[PDB]
Amino acid sequence: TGKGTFRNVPFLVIEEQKQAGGRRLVKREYPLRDTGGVNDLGKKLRSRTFSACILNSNAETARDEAGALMDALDAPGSGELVHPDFGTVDVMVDSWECRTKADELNYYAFTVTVYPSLQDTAPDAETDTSAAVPAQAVAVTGSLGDTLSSVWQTVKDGTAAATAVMEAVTGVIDDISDAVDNLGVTQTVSGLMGSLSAMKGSVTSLINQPAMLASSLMGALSGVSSLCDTRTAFSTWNRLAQRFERRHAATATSYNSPVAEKNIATLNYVMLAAAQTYRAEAASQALTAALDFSRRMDNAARAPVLDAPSTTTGTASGASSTSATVTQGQLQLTTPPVFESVSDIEKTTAMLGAALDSVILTASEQGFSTDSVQLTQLRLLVVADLEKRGLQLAGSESHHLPETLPAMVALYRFTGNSRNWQRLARRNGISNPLFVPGGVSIEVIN
């Protein structure tokens, strides 16, 4: 029995039932040229339509059912259309009719046209994971500085406690100055070096001022961070953290005081946490730089021509800056050897995660709560950025090879566009692209 319904109001199918919809095409016809064509643009909605009839042997139940159908078709919202041909769909009505003939006492004829209830936004907001790392790093650094300022206790004596606190502060300053000096082979670091020298020369009056000491150190670290570009930041921060760590493990008679053990331990810890957070931010930026450089906007089936200028990439001589579109990597610089391949990104992500987890577990005992609560979210954001932008790329597949093929042939067999043949070799980690290993799994991007 043909018992299609709209809103649990029964109706009988009759006459014709149809579905129409295709792609939107734009016709491109050139003057004084013959070969033309069209271009694709999405797909238009599926405009369903049907013709239904309601009749009975009473001429009053027919009127009641017809009125129910009118008031159910003319209702606000979307209803479950059930049709023997369409199926079970959710549609919004567009227009309908109710035709009788004043001679047929029982028959009432309807003709409905419906549209799918597809409600999707145009902008389609997503999350910007690249820009969520610096925002969290700023809060983590601020919380660490506040914790150091709060937990620092002034010692007033001139004994082993005071001299040992002096040694710890001057050692931290020495490490920072050594990092800046190693940087300064190319970059000009005169101002930061002079500020560090003056700050070291004035320790006695710092260890007694807690807030000034914490800032004096956070400002130095911020200056070190601002010195580096996207090329050496990861290397420099890697070094300062290794060094600050070799420390926090030599700490974890002399003094005979507890307000020293605590000051030294909190100082060493805060230094470790700040260095590792800056390392995480630098890694997040290095990923963007590497992905930007590993991008080739060619992606077309053209024929090579005898183009004299710029035999290899670059730009034509004499072209201004207005002609070239800037990319995100250049816009932020105002690449490392590790962030190129895939196994390397995996190892880097694992190392960052382990280091930050250890820092959190240690922080849960000095600088108790706020630092750990901020650092866990920072770790989540950093690892999410790394995994979502480096490995979980769009259309990445894994294939094996029956024999060792050149990278171009291997790429063409799997995707059909051989121009991005360097990307496959770089991401796999091959030295010579002509010999891509056979039995080993190969990541092919599409």
Partner: protein, 115 residues
Amino acid sequence: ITAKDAQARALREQRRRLAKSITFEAEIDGWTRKDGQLWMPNLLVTIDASKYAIKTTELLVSKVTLILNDQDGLKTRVSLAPREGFLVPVESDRGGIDALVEDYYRRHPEKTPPW
């Protein structure tokens, strides 16, 4: 104003009038260029509109507008003006050792001048 400054502005005015007088406009099909990058201003293109009896050979793009309408599709309306209208009064469109060296370092801009 001095004499050299006077000629500089007088030429600037002449070249701006030259640029504003002659205008080419075209509607190409693709946002991307032939090489693959986007269409942007300040580019020297070679015009070969000989079928319409037009004797211009080289022009400089002056305005690029990209469109994504539904009735249009992907289009970019590119406007062209002669290059000789956007030059500085020193240079020209194609008396001593100093002049020769300046001419060489002007023909080759990617080189570093002596300054």
